[PDB]
Design an enzyme around this catalytic site. Structure first.
Site, short mmCIF file in Angstrom:
data_model
loop_
_atom_site.label_atom_id
_atom_site.label_comp_id
_atom_site.label_asym_id
_atom_site.label_seq_id
_atom_site.Cartn_x
_atom_site.Cartn_y
_atom_site.Cartn_z
N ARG A 1 -50.92 -37.36 -87.19
CA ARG A 1 -51.32 -36.11 -86.49
C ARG A 1 -52.84 -35.94 -86.50
O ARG A 1 -53.44 -36.12 -87.55
CB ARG A 1 -50.70 -34.86 -87.13
CG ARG A 1 -49.19 -34.89 -87.26
CD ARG A 1 -48.45 -34.85 -85.93
NE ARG A 1 -48.96 -33.84 -85.02
CZ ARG A 1 -48.76 -33.84 -83.71
NH1 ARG A 1 -48.04 -34.80 -83.16
NH2 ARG A 1 -49.28 -32.89 -82.97
N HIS B 1 -45.49 -38.98 -75.40
CA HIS B 1 -46.02 -40.33 -75.22
C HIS B 1 -45.08 -41.18 -74.39
O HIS B 1 -44.02 -41.60 -74.87
CB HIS B 1 -46.23 -41.01 -76.57
CG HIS B 1 -47.53 -40.69 -77.22
ND1 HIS B 1 -47.71 -39.57 -77.99
CD2 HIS B 1 -48.72 -41.35 -77.23
CE1 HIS B 1 -48.95 -39.54 -78.45
NE2 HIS B 1 -49.58 -40.62 -78.00
N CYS C 1 -52.03 -43.72 -79.65
CA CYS C 1 -52.62 -43.80 -78.32
C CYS C 1 -52.97 -42.40 -77.82
O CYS C 1 -52.19 -41.46 -77.96
CB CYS C 1 -51.65 -44.47 -77.35
SG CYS C 1 -52.26 -44.56 -75.67
N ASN D 1 -39.09 -34.80 -74.19
CA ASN D 1 -39.91 -35.71 -74.98
C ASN D 1 -39.05 -36.66 -75.82
O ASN D 1 -39.10 -37.89 -75.67
CB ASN D 1 -40.85 -34.82 -75.83
CG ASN D 1 -41.85 -35.59 -76.62
OD1 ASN D 1 -41.61 -36.74 -77.01
ND2 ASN D 1 -42.98 -34.94 -76.92
MN LIG Z 1 -42.18 -38.81 -77.65
ZN LIG Z 2 -50.43 -45.71 -74.87
#
Ligand SMILES: [Mn+2]
Ligand SMILES: [Zn+2]
Ligand SMILES: [Mn+2]
Ligand SMILES: [Zn+2]
Ligand SMILES: [Zn+2]
Ligand SMILES: [Zn+2]
Lengths: 162, 162
Positions: free
Chosen positions: A60, A97, A104, A118
DNA sequence: TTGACTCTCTTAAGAGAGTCA
DNA sequence: TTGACTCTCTTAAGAGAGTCA
């Protein structure tokens, strides 16, 4: 309150800093037996992380800027979406993500959606394997597949019907 | 308890008690535009729940039996699997509702798998829509679909590539 | 104003154990 | 011995805020 111009300047400084993160090329499953390539911009494993960035947990981070003597702080992946609605259908929007790579911070690998949406991408068959996400997945989810179930449905007697 | 005979006796008494729970018919999406019928054996909403059962949480229950003068207690959905390994690949095995109905205790609607496999069924297209779970789903997951993403991947500058 | 740490919290699939009668 | 309550914990996708120099 921060003006639109001030928010855009925060997004611009964030992009300029993240853009200098190491860029790592990853080959990934797309579904349908096909392979693709993603380019992740990865925050360093330990301090220093980059101007404005600090770690608040194992995976985090937060972004911080001081504007007109006031400290402002955001979750490190939320910055691309500061001009977007922050909830939908009564659910909080989360940074999600598409590359499934927490470190990333490439904004082309992020979307902004409910925590359920998500999470669900973890099991998606992928953009070439049947993804139905309206904002399409960039890859097959890491947990897609037959699973590893230890025991299936069963009864010892005759008390039940399916 | 310790003996296989004692474990079988626990499973058998659990099955007899759950077999007397009200049977509620639920019509469910299967995927592929098809619909099916499941018969859930639903624990009551309020006490008394049945011999050996008690509520520890809004949607959590435990089964308890006294064996050799000692109280033995289990999560209410774990009892069918007391003879199975309690971990897999170093992950805890969990009772997993194929019918996505917590109050249901029909063992023909339960499997025993990692929490990740368990969660992932929420987004499965279903047994007639492409489920690849080796222990097959009974229905399309309740969260399957296009999602409600508020914002997709985007950048303001020219620093990033996919 | 900035960096590098510290702490606890949310969600929705799941858990264990204690207090009384 | 059985019933009906109470409390906190786990996981892995995500969060906000404090302290010190
Ligand atoms: Mn995710
Ligand atoms: Zn990435
Ligand atoms: Mn489940
Ligand atoms: Zn998808
Ligand atoms: Zn059921
Ligand atoms: Zn399935």
């Amino acid at each position: 309150a921060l003006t639109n111009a001030q928010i855009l300047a925060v997004i611009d400084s964030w992009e300029e800093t993240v853009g200098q993160f190491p860029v790592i090329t990853h080959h990934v499953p797309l579904g349908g037996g096909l392979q693709g390539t993603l380019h992740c911009y990865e925050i360093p494993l330990a301090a220093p992380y980059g101007v404005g960035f600090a770690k608040n947990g194992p995976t985090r981070w937060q972004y911080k800027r001081t504007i007109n003597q006031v400290v402002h702080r955001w979750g490190s992946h939320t910055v691309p979406f500061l001009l977007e609605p922050d909830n939908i259908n009564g659910k909080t929007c989360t940074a999600s993500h598409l590359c499934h790579n927490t470190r990333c911070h490439n904004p082309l690998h992020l979307c902004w959606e409910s925590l359920d949406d998500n999470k669900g991408r973890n099991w998606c068959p992928g953009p070439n394997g049947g993804c139905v996400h309206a904002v399409v997945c960039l890859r097959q989810g890491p947990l897609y597949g037959p699973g590893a179930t230890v025991a299936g449905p069963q009864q010892r007697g005759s008390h039940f019907v399916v």
